Structures are given as structure tokens and as C-alpha cells.
Symmetry: D2
Subunit: 166 residues, 4 copies
């Protein structure tokens, strides 16, 4: 069985960091529209919170992919990102394989700018070069859950981020 | 050219009502697992806030559909057979997509299938459909915010507003 | 994976396809038909079958799989409401996936809904589902060819064969 | 919508399909091939072509939809159904009914190249090269047709006429 071990990032710490990241995004794209693309499923909570602190004209869409072995696209975007500022939102980036493929895919739409925003980053686990421009936290725990992130579809409802162990 | 007119439901009114619905849901399914299925795209904010107030074991998934009957764009991945299912929507107006989704999910043989909508425009119905959980019944006007768009705009407002 | 014995020759397939087409043509004389092919295997049979049908035909495709419950991967785009529908399959064994697909389509209120399969294995049924049009009924458990694969291979054989 | 004249008969189509299959066979002698058919209009042509190819063939399908105005000037399309099979390091032939402006297929070409295939070639039943808005030369071509509306052999006019066993012009 899997059980929660420790709280890694509290609800308050998460909201403070989301505010911090929204502010940086607002400054980096001051006076401009932004298109925010959330990578399903785990990033939806972070995205929901993040966009509510971004006051720019924001368009939101979702993308779904699953990798194997390149990467298969399950649900492509509907919105137009050609000539637009795009921020792709993720819960965690570790190997970076899926996101690297999404990056090339979005570049084919010829956006004005394409940046990646991840709540959590594990750069040490990279299998390809993919540097996120916005990173909430760098957390070392092996199995992380909460705030949209699951373990075997469980724990996405926690309002904080926790570690789990066997 | 669309502009915000008035705030219809404030950020605080929304969070008060979200807590109330969550408590209702927790009581209705006390001691049981629940599967929450959010109807994309506009329900994702409501869903994110709602599930954070539900302490039951929760599984979440998403469905995408559109009118042409209703066309299913993205079906669920999770198992709902023998499970308690709550389908979460931003607004129910005609009730058509949701009625179809109801028949669709019933084919999976869930233990229970309930609908939870933040907003309801009951004057807009095209088929009989009553959501078990309804945040607010509202006038039939154009609204935006809290996940809900007007031509892809305004989903980022933390409140619900009317537009003109 | 090696090919063993030819079970149904290219010639036998073509003779049978013509027979089924004639049957369909008389069952829907003077009427339009929507042919829906269940991806992927059935595309070859469907391509051949419709080319022998003189009626005005509309074609579309559906994709669905088991959860191990049938998951809808790709829904239809065309209007079948009030139309004559023939769902085309390569093989019907359990009928599970096609029974689900049958209720799904019925949600669209077609005028008629019939099933047409190249091969039928009624002895493998796990739900009642009778195909109105059936090409062959053979017992061979592992077959490839004419759209049917073994691990994605051999769909291109112009005949149906057993594999070892 | 009325059928004018038969442009290419059932028999003529099958003779060129056979010839294309032979070309493909000699170009990939001794190798596996992955054939990707672009839905929906290419399914008949694909069904016929693969049955004349002796190589180990894997088939899959891709479906894309336009974004509206932009697609007609940039070819940008949304992937509705992506491929399931692996094409990394594989010989890939993308099968189409018609190439006109070539904008959409050029986009799809870039998508496939992202999977790093060993080879990537395009095979179209019909070609209208004088309608190109981007450089895209199909390695395998059935026929050039003088810009009309044509139907049959998987190709529709408002979802109609895909079941004709021949290609015909339509008024």
C-alpha cells in the first residue's frame, strides 16, 4: 500500500509561489496577450490558480500526449497560437521527453514566444535538454502527490504537496 | 468588442459556495470513493477548487464533447464501473450535452451518477435534466470568469461577471 | 510470426464481398446508406464492399477499444439521425465492443442499424449480437490478412491466412 | 451535384496502383515499410496499394482538421488522430488522395519528421502541382488531373460518391 509520508509544500507556500510566478509572467509579457496551454491532466490545479493571478488578456487551452518506448498526441490544441506568446504549464518536469516533443510541436504553429512553466522541476532527471523558464520548486522526494498530481490516480485532491512511500 | 459589465458572483461568494457543495458531496458519499469527471474546458477551475474541499478518496478525469445528439471528442480513461460518479460542469443551460453524457456514462454501469454544476440557467432547458448539486441559478445572460469564456476570453477572472 | 495456410483466397473474398453487396443493395433498394467502418482492420473489407454497392453511400469511421466498458477513441462526424446505417467489421467474436457501439449509435436515433462482418465467431459471444450480413464463419483462432493483423503485421495480404 | 464523365476507370486505377506498388517495392527492397494513410479519402487507394506490396507492411492512419482561414494560407492543421505505430528509424510512406496546395501535407511532413524516421516519402493518387503554394514533390503519383471537382475511389463531394469504383469529374 502507498501512504503519505511528509508534507513537502503547504497550501500557503503553494499560493505564495503561484503569486510569485504570475507576477513574473505579467512582467515578462507586460502589455501583451498570453496563451496558456495546460498539459493534462496533473497541471490543471496549478493552471487554475496561476491564471487567476495573471491579469493580462489570457486565452487557455489544453494538450494531451502520452510517450512510449517518440510521443503520441491525444488531444491537440484548438486555439490559435500563431504570432502569440505561449506559456505551457506543467505539474512536474523530470525526463523532459514529452515536453520536448510538445515544444517542437508548438513551434510548428509559429508562435511569437514559447515558454515553459512547471510547478516542480527535477532537472537532474533530464533525458533531453529542456529548460523551463518558470519553475515553482525543485523538490528531491521520490514520489510526490497532491495539488493535481497523482499516485496511481489517487491524491490529486490534496491541497498541499506531499511525498508518498510504500 | 466585449466588455465586462458587472460582477455577478464575487470570488468570496464562489469560494463559500464551493465549500458548501463539497460538504454536501462528502456527506452524500461518506466513507466511499468518488470519481469526479470534469466536462472540459470551462469547468476546470470549479473542479480544481471543488476537489480541494472533498476529503474522500477522489479520482479525477475529463471528458470533451460538442454538438453536431452530441459528439464525443475525448472519452474518459478511468474506470467508473461500480463507482460513485460526479460529473462537474460550469453551466447547465439546454442540458443536451449533459443528458447525452448521462446516457453515455450509464453505459459504464457506475454505482451512482450525479451532476454538479456551478451555475444553472433553468429557463434554457431543451430536455429534462436536474443536477443534484447546483451552486447558483442565474439569469439568462452572457457571463464570463472562473473558467468560463466569451470567445476564449476572460476565463482568468477570479469572479463571475456579465459582459456586453 | 510466419504465414501458414491460406484459409480464404483473394478470389473467395471477392466473390463473397459481391454477394454481401447484392444483399445490402436489395435490403435498401432506393435508399441512402451510411457505412461506418470500425478501425483499423475493417478498412480493406469496407473499401471493397462499398465499391459494389450502387446506392448513394456515405462512409465514416469509428475507433473504440476495451478498458479490460468500451472506450470511444474516435466518434463519427456524419449525421446518421434518421438514416440507414451499416456498421462494418472485420471480425465479431465477443460482440462486446460492438454491442456498446450499438447503444451509442442508437443515442443518435438512426432509421436502421445493421451489422456487417467479414468473419463471424458466434461461439465466442459474451453478449447477444447478431450480424445481419456475415461473410464467413471459420474456426481458425489465429488469422491475418485482408486488413486483419497479428501484432500490426500482415494486414496487407490480399488473402486470409493462418499464422504460427 | 452530377457526375460528368469517367476520368479514370476501375481498371486504369488498378494498373497504376500496381505500378506504384512495384516502384515502392524496388525502392525499399528487403525492408519493412510503414504506410500511413491520411483519412478519410485515401483509404480505398491505401487498401488497394498495400495489397500489391510484398514487403512487411505496417499500416496506420492520421487525421487532421483545419483551423479555418489560417490553414488555407499556412497549412497549419490540428491533429485529430495521431499515429499509434512507431516510425522512428522506419521507412515511411504517407498516402494521400490528392495533393493540391500542399500546405497541409507539408505540415504533416514536419510532424512525421519529429519522430525521426529512416525515410519519409509521399504517395498521392492524384496531384495538382500547378496548385502548389509550397514546395512538395510527391515521390509517387498516380495521376495529374486538370483542376476540376472529382469524386470516386474514396474521394468525396460533400461526403458523397466515395464508393464509385472509378474517378469521375462532377459538375
Amino acid at each position: 500500500n502507498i501512504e503519505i509520508k511528509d508534507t513537502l509544500i503547504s497550501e500557503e507556500q503553494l499560493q505564495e509561489k503561484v503569486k510569485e510566478l504570475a507576477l513574473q509572467i505579467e512582467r515578462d509579457f507586460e502589455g501583451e496577450e498570453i496563451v496558456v496551454i495546460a498539459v493534462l491532466k496533473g497541471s490543471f490545479v496549478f493552471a487554475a490558480d496561476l491564471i487567476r493571478h495573471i491579469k493580462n488578456d489570457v486565452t487557455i487551452d489544453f494538450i494531451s500526449a502520452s510517450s512510449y518506448g517518440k510521443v503520441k498526441l491525444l488531444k491537440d490544441i484548438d486555439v490559435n497560437i500563431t504570432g502569440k506568446n505561449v506559456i505551457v504549464v506543467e505539474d512536474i518536469i523530470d525526463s523532459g521527453l514529452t515536453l520536448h516533443f510538445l515544444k517542437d510541436h508548438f513551434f510548428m504553429h509559429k508562435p511569437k514566444a514559447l515558454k515553459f512553466c512547471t510547478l516542480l522541476d527535477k532537472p537532474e532527471r533530464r533525458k533531453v535538454d529542456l529548460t523551463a523558464e518558470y519553475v515553482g520548486f525543485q523538490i528531491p522526494d521520490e514520489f510526490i502527490v497532491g495539488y493535481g498530481i497523482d499516485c496511481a490516480e489517487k491524491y490529486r485532491n490534496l491541497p498541499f504537496i506531499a511525498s508518498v512511500v510504500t
